[PDB]
Design a protein around this ligand. Structure first.
Ligand SMILES: [Mg+2]
Ligand SMILES: [Mg+2]
Ligand SMILES: [Mg+2]
Ligand SMILES: [Mg+2]
Ligand SMILES: [Mg+2]
Ligand SMILES: [Mg+2]
Ligand SMILES: [Mg+2]
Ligand SMILES: [Mg+2]
Ligand SMILES: [Mg+2]
Ligand SMILES: [Mg+2]
Ligand SMILES: [Mg+2]
Ligand SMILES: [Mg+2]
Ligand SMILES: [Mg+2]
Ligand SMILES: [Mg+2]
Ligand SMILES: [Mg+2]
Ligand SMILES: [Mg+2]
Ligand SMILES: [Mg+2]
Ligand SMILES: [Mg+2]
Ligand SMILES: [Mg+2]
Ligand SMILES: [Mg+2]
Ligand SMILES: [Mg+2]
Ligand SMILES: [Mg+2]
Ligand SMILES: [Mg+2]
Ligand SMILES: [Mg+2]
Ligand SMILES: [Mg+2]
Ligand SMILES: [Mg+2]
Ligand SMILES: [Mg+2]
Ligand SMILES: [Mg+2]
Ligand SMILES: [Mg+2]
Ligand SMILES: [Mg+2]
Ligand SMILES: [Mg+2]
Ligand SMILES: [Zn+2]
Lengths: 60, 83, 97, 23, 206
RNA sequence: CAGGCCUUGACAUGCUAGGGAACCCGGGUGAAAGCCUGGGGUGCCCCGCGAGGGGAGCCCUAGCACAGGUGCUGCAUGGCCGUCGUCAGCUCGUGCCGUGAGGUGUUGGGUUAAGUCCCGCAACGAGCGCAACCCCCGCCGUUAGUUGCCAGCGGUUCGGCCGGGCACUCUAACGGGACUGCCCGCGAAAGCGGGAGGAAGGAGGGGACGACGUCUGGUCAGCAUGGCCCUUACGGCCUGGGCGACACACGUGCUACAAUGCCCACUACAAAGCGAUGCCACCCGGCAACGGGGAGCUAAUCGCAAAAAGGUGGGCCCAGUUCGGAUUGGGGUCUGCAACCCGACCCCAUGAAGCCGGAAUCGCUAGUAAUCGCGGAUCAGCCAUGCCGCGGUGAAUACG
């Protein structure tokens, strides 16, 4: 139950509380960041490839 | 609980059942899934079969169980004991 | 008239601010220098591995640098000349008054 | 202590307000 | 888990971002999704052209897109017969104005993605793996690079037990930040599974 | 999981045929999905004032190629991660020794956090690691002075509010500064001890960074992928339930067992963050949660925001207590279509165990431990006492 779940989440529900976020890259439903729309795994992958503008490794 | 500025909630599909009964031969056996529906004083006297997730449990309503919800009278877990 | 310019990369933003300051003196209007505003830093922390290794993490940060430029006098000749400038695509501007 | 909702310390611990911790 | 991504480690020091634009909290994710869509579409379009790098650049409702390929003619075609076409669909895939640029790579031997892609293509052709790694590393070293490394992981030669074979020459200082190291990755989908190919090319220190 | 439902399917290309759809508001039954349903409209290219017929964005019915599977295998795999271990190592070219596996180099002496460096040597050199190159903190300088700040000046409704200034603090870019650099001693040398100066002294403090390899290590449920398996069901939709069970056992935490304390009132002092179906000033009503008006702020401008420990004053007087706040009864607020199973918060009442914990076991060497509060991600709401960060107060000890 992966493709159907992704499409159903992409669909409008009868109630507004039944809408939940999913990762726009791999379809994950857990740990999805609002700022990027991506899950933590995809976020790390894309950040290591320089494809996230202004995003850099943090160290202080 | 629910706020008194809002009314007490009934699903309006079971309320229609009891209301239509009250003027058309008011005693039968209704099966419902609305465990969240609140019992109403009009519902007193009816036997309602409430889903527990597996089966419909018949509940006969009385006066001292008016403000509760239907789901509180259909237990959902069977325990017995350990051993 | 106040121009606020923001960007992810500070080098190109600084170059744009210096370009604005230098060009604004072609028809001098008592130019007010490009001042820096507090950088806004957004942090994200992720589990390093795809599964179960909570104690290992990686930190990422995204920073927004902000600079401000003011011209005391309008300088319409220098104002209409500011329409078509050399703006790096990473620099987002906003003019106001 | 911090586990008592009817004190300033307990409301501070829960991060709420009321009669005992007014705003 | 052992090694950090060579490019991610040096972002803002030696390497530069592949996408360069500014967006606020309201527009960042939609532009990012559009960028991923564009890159994914172009990846399966110019594969035979030798697609190394795709750069997305946005000013205001207009996006640049500059691609770097081994053979620009494979992207442009006869009088641009393909160059225009790949642009038009892109607009129909973005709803904006696009300025697709084509750039030639001076040395295909010095671009780690191209080396990795070539090695993966050879592996898919049921070629020998160890010979391929040796030959690719020697080819890179023959073009003035100060060092090179190629690593292949998987069921090398269809074997039932996965192995890792790597070759190296010169210098590959992965712990040096001033070192300009280009990293490339490729996948080989053989009938017996997927093999991973990694390429490191060292081009001196800035 | 139970029940009710669908069949080329909730998603993708293609071959047909019958309609030609395309897009939009209503009818019965049902818990909903669904089933049976009642009223209008396709551009574009056509013969064209013609009945109309043709190719076309696109849709449905009946067939197919097929889609779909969080179904199995991490003992077929990629990618990523944990671990030995930020440990001081692991190797290579040529030469030389050995029948050979192999050795030497890389062993010995001194030194270092370090295969760090020096000396000696059948070795002479090199690579991956160490270190350095990058970030934050600590001192200073240049560029600047708004929404930042207010030393001097003049006003003032007493707030930098104003004029004004960039002195100072600060903000953020660029630089300098620390390198055994100097003096004394020790030693072939590397280096070790002492001192001056300096904000900083011997790696200045903290991050980022993890060698060849090991563990048949973890992940087919994040993704990808070989093989195997299902195909009006192991696919798909809905409602309800379960993941929240409970004779017990264990791990990680929170709150305490009190007077170096608890309660009440007044009164100080931060940092880093977040905010447009948002943050919400202020005023009104309720003891309150909160509700009703309603500014300012797309935010160095407005808000969250009260910091708490602290300081001052008073009360409690050694008690299961004005310690402790579990459990339960009742009245409410808010979010959500809906708080029964199974949310959070306010008020009233209830006021359990607990008097410092057996064998045993854990963390920590300095702005550390301990202790106090604050923010953020996810998020309608929240079961967060978790996690990632931030600052306030601030020890003891290391003989060996
Ligand atoms: Mg299923
Ligand atoms: Mg939600
Ligand atoms: Mg989600
Ligand atoms: Mg394994
Ligand atoms: Mg693996
Ligand atoms: Mg070892
Ligand atoms: Mg040898
Ligand atoms: Mg011999
Ligand atoms: Mg050794
Ligand atoms: Mg040896
Ligand atoms: Mg070390
Ligand atoms: Mg060395
Ligand atoms: Mg290092
Ligand atoms: Mg100054
Ligand atoms: Mg195993
Ligand atoms: Mg397992
Ligand atoms: Mg899978
Ligand atoms: Mg599989
Ligand atoms: Mg659970
Ligand atoms: Mg329970
Ligand atoms: Mg544990
Ligand atoms: Mg415990
Ligand atoms: Mg607690
Ligand atoms: Mg008491
Ligand atoms: Mg008490
Ligand atoms: Mg509930
Ligand atoms: Mg007792
Ligand atoms: Mg006592
Ligand atoms: Mg133990
Ligand atoms: Mg220590
Ligand atoms: Mg806890
Ligand atoms: Zn993802």
């Amino acid at each position: 139950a992966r493709k159907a779940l992704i499409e159903k989440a992409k669909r409008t529900p009868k109630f507004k509380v039944r809408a939940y976020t999913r990762c726009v890259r791999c379809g994950r439903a857990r740990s999805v960041y609002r700022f990027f729309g991506l899950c933590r795994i995809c976020l790390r992958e894309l950040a290591h490839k320089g494809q996230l503008p202004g995003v850099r490794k943090a160290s202080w | 609980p629910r706020s008194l500025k809002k009314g007490v909630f009934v699903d309006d599909h079971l309320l229609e059942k009891v209301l239509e009964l009250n003027a058309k031969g008011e005693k039968r056996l209704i099966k419902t899934w609305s465990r969240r529906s609140t019992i109403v004083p009009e519902m007193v006297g009816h036997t309602i079969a409430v889903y527990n997730g597996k089966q419909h449990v018949p509940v006969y309503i009385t006066e001292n169980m008016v403000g509760h919800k239907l789901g509180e009278f259909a237990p959902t877990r069977t325990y017995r004991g350990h051993g | 008239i106040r121009i606020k310019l923001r960007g992810f990369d500070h080098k190109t933003l600084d170059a744009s601010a210096q370009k604005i300051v230098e060009a604004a003196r072609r028809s001098g209007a008592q130019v007010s220098g490009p001042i820096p505003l507090p950088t806004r830093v957004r942090r994200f922390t992720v589990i390093r591995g795809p599964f179960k290794h909570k104690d290992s993490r990686e930190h990422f940060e995204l920073r927004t640098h902000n600079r401000l430029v003011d011209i005391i006098n309008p300088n319409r000749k220098t104002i209409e000349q500011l329409m078509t400038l050399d703006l790096p695509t990473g620099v987002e501007i906003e003019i106001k008054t | 202590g911090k586990g008592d909702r009817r004190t300033r310390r307990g409301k501070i611990w829960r991060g709420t307000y009321g009669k005992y911790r007014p705003r | 888990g052992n090694k950090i991504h060579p490019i991610g480690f040096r972002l803002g020091i030696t390497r530069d971002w592949e996408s360069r634009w500014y967006a606020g909290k309201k527009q960042y994710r939609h532009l990012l999704l559009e960028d991923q869509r564009i890159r994914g579409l172009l990846e399966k379009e110019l594969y035979s052209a030798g697609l190394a790098r795709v750069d997305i650049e946005r000013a205001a409702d207009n996006v640049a897109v500059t691609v770097h390929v081994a053979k620009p003619g494979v992207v442009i075609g006869r009088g641009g017969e393909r160059i225009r076409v790949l642009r038009e669909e892109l607009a129909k895939l973005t709803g904006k104005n696009v300025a697709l640029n084509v750039q030639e790579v001076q040395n295909p031997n010095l671009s780690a993605p191209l080396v990795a892609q070539r090695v993966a293509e050879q592996i898919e052709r049921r070629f020998a793996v160890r010979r391929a790694i040796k030959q690719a590393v020697q080819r890179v070293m023959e073009s003035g690079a100060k060092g090179a490394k190629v690593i292949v992981s998987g069921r090398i030669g269809g074997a039932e037990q996965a192995r890792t074979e790597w070759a190296a020459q010169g210098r590959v200082p992965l712990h040096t930040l001033r070192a300009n190291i280009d990293y490339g990755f490729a996948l080989a989908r053989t009938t017996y599974g997927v093999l991973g190919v990694k390429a490191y090319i060292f081009l001196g220190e800035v």
